[PDB]
Design an enzyme around this catalytic site. Structure first.
Site: not given
Ligand SMILES: COc1cccc(-c2cccc([C@H](NC(=N)N)c3ccncc3)c2)c1
Length: 369
Positions: A32, A215
């Site tokens: 992430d 992202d």
């Molecule tokens: C494409 O990848 C994907 C696909 C599906 C879900 C997620 C995902 C799952 C849970 C959270 C997040 C989410 N991360 C984002 N970058 N939006 C996040 C939110 C709050 N704290 C930490 C991270 C992203 C990431």
């Protein structure tokens, strides 16, 4: 050895195998770039195959500090500590890093995603509960001789994360760099948007209202309302030989065609012009429908190929998500405060069009907020 270390998809997330604690506990962790906490499931959950058991790690240190993260679609909470962390198919090192042990959550973990935590690769400014919590990559660089850079090849084995370097076998042509505007999210500047070679003709600030980020933890290309509405109008006009339900353009429903007959040619290319490393110079990244139409794999609809429109409206700025990154080899050059893009050796294309990274382009105002 780091090549092909990722698995997953744009819809559910790309992940890397990691180990936490001593003796090491193996976990699959979401890559992430849109967040900054190393946060792992540390209690049973119906969607979790495994979790972090702090009781089994002699190297675990409790920081005596809680963490509550409510976000728009859900929430996660738990507690902070530090432990030994390694990436089995990453660099040959072990580091001590902050870890948020997730003890309670709402709509965070995804059924069948095959990951148990998130590796927030962005900067300390956006770490929770505050900016004093050192993110993983910062600890990795401080504690080792690993260069302050990482690169991502997302392949729609599911891809590669190269820590500490750039692997030439992962891309073709040249690497073009856009500056990191501010070290919080990986913030960038879009200077121009074209849909089927036609300029959207908006003031460039519109494209970056209120920020534009790269992202890997967001599925879609997310656009500010004004940009989103113009993009949809231009894509609708180019694909007018077929009429889809309004739910399709809202990213709410699927569009299906008999297997192997998707009419790629009716959909336009989208070019995102990113700010260059020199004044008023830019380069463009070109996206095909093979990127913005995300397949939804489902055995029940398998006589067909069904897709979700992977461009959606944002109230929080532009998000160049996983479907956009899939077309390219993306270098997060933290040491030089810049992001590199090059055509990925794994991007999905046809016999008529290819995703592209090209420049330079010259324009003779600032595009940032
Ligand atoms: C494409 O990848 C994907 C696909 C599906 C879900 C997620 C995902 C799952 C849970 C959270 C997040 C989410 N991360 C984002 N970058 N939006 C996040 C939110 C709050 N704290 C930490 C991270 C992203 C990431």
């Amino acid at each position: 050895e780091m090549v092909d270390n990722l698995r997953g998809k744009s819809g559910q997330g790309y992940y890397v195998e990691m180990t936490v604690g001593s003796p090491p506990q193996t976990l699959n962790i979401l890559v992430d770039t849109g967040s900054s906490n190393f946060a792992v499931g540390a209690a049973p959950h119906p969607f979790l195959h495994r979790y972090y058991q702090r009781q089994l790690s002699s190297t675990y240190r409790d920081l005596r500090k809680g963490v509550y993260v409510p976000y728009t679609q859900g929430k996660w909470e738990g507690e902070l500590g530090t432990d030994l962390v390694s990436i089995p198919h990453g660099p040959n090192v072990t580091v001590r890093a902050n870890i948020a042990a997730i003890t309670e959550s709402d709509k965070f973990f995804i059924n069948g995603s095959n990951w148990e935590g998130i590796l927030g690769l962005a900067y300390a400014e956006i770490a929770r509960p505050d900016d004093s919590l050192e993110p993983f990559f910062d600890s990795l660089v401080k504690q080792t001789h690993v260069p302050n850079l990482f690169s991502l090849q997302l392949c729609g084995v599911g891809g590669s994360m190269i820590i500490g370097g750039i692997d030439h076998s992962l891309y073709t042509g040249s690497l073009w760099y856009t500056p990191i505007r501010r070290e919080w999210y990986y913030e960038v500047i879009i200077v121009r948007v074209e849909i089927n070679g036609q300029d959207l003709k908006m003031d460039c600030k519109e494209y970056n209202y209120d920020k534009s980020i790269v992202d890997s933890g967001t599925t879609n290309l997310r656009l500010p309302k004004k940009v989103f509405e113009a993009a949809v109008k231009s894509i609708k006009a180019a694909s007018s030989t077929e009429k889809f339900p309004d739910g399709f353009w809202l990213g709410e429903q699927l569009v299906c065609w008999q297997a192997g007959t998707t009419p790629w040619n009716i959909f336009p290319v989208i070019s995102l012009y990113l700010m260059g490393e020199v004044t008023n110079q830019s380069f463009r990244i070109t996206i095909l429908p093979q990127q913005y139409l995300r397949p939804v794999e489902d055995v029940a609809t398998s006589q067909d190929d069904c897709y979700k429109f992977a461009i959606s409206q944002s109230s929080t700025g532009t998000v160049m998500g996983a479907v956009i990154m899939e077309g390219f080899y993306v270098v997060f050059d933290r040491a030089r405060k810049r992001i590199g893009f090059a055509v990925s050796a794994c991007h999905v294309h046809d016999e008529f069009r290819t995703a592209a990274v090209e420049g330079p382009f010259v324009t003779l105002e600032d595009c940032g907020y």
